Amino acid sequence: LYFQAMNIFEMLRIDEGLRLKIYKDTYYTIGIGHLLTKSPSLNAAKSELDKAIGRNTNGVITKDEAEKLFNQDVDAAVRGILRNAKLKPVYDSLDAVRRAALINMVFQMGETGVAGFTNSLRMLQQKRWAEAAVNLAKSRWYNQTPNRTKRVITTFATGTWDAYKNLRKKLEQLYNRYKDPQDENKIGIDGIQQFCDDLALDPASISVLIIAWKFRAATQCEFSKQEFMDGMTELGCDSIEKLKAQIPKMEQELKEPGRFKDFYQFTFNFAKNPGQKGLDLEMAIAYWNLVLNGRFKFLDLWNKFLLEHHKRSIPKDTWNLLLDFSTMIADDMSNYDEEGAWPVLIDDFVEFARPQI
Numbered sequence: 001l002y003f004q005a006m007n008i009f010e011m012l013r014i015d016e017g018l019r020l021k022i023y024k025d026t027y028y029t030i031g032i033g034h035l036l037t038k039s040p041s042l043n044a045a046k047s048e049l050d051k052a053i054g055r056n057t058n059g060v061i062t063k064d065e066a067e068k069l070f071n072q073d074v075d076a077a078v079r080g081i082l083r084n085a086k087l088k089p090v091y092d093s094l095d096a097v098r099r100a101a102l103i104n105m106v107f108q109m110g111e112t113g114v115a116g117f118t119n120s121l122r123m124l125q126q127k128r129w130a131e132a133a134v135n136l137a138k139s140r141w142y143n144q145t146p147n148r149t150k151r152v153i154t155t156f157a158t159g160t161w162d163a164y165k166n167l168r169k170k171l172e173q174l175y176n177r178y179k180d181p182q183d184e185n186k187i188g189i190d191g192i193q194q195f196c197d198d199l200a201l202d203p204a205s206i207s208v209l210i211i212a213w214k215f216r217a218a219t220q221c222e223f224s225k226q227e228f229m230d231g232m233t234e235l236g237c238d239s240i241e242k243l244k245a246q247i248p249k250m251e252q253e254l255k256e257p258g259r260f261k262d263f264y265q266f267t268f269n270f271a272k273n274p275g276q277k278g279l280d281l282e283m284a285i286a287y288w289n290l291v292l293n294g295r296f297k298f299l300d301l302w303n304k305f306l307l308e309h310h311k312r313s314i315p316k317d318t319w320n321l322l323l324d325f326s327t328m329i330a331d332d333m334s335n336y337d338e339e340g341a342w343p344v345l346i347d348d349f350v351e352f353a354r355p356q357i
């Protein structure tokens, strides 16, 4: 296998993204789109992953492990392309860099999807790079993934890694403005403040929390280099101005209850201290005031109730269920099911609140 792929791993890590934990596909997946099983059983998915890696991974792997899986998929993709009468001649005719761009297309839309680009593939085989680049930009492929597609088209247009090299340069330069002087691998207190200042936003604002959700950031007041790099690339941003222009789209998403529920539950995980399973009361109240503002009629009475009668940590299930409570609760609380499976804390709140109407 060693006689037969160095830049291809980084090309698809940028275009498709690298996931280190087993995730749900629109199917059990890990790494750069590696399929584990067609089964709906996670036990089966973990078994396949454990067999493929050679250890009890419990659904979590390293980047080197993700690379080993990726190299297997590249090889399988190459075998498939060569068995395809519509793709083999174009693949054979192409140089190493342009083959990597064709494998990228196969990874995205499969062989049948790629074979559909008959006019474009002909131009590539004919080495009419300018004509092929213009033609590929006309497709729906270009609108569905404009950032990824432009990068792949550039690879076919130039036969170089310039689209990937230049994105990484732009992000690396931008990163240097925010990196911690005491730790190059992260953005510190100062850096996060600067990032927020550059976006003309307060670091405790709802907009910054929406950005944190979109970046899948782990913890408040922390921001790793990997979080910044992956977040900026997944969002198709290479500057603060581009990220700033993405905020209204992120805001519109939250008007749909499914997205709002995902963001609301993410807030708990983001707000909590690493090493703690619960969220401290003062912190829970501060984030509730931000995310439940204009969504929960009883928010202030809830805060007063907790500060005087609970005075303890908030578990994840209670945090999650509070959104369901806020949605269903009547203004007079007359519809509250005192025997309807709510946490005891919410039964206690309704008992405390009801005399005050």
Ligand SMILES: CCC(=O)N[C@@H](Cc1nc2ccc(C(C)C)cc2s1)C(=O)N[C@H](CNC(=O)/C=C/CN1CCOCC1)C1CCCCC1
Pocket: 189, 192, 195, 196, 203, 204, 205, 206, 208, 209, 211, 212, 213, 215, 217, 219, 220, 221, 222, 223, 286, 287, 290
């Ligand atoms: C709402 C967004 C939100 O979580 N902001 C973080 C700050 C941010 N975190 C990230 C992380 C990542 C990224 C990326 C996505 C760009 C942006 C940011 S900006 C906040 O102010 N957290 C406080 C809580 N925590 C603190 O007050 C911690 C203070 C630190 N110590 C040590 C230094 O001296 C002071 C004490 C709350 C925010 C809500 C209102 C109450 C305070």
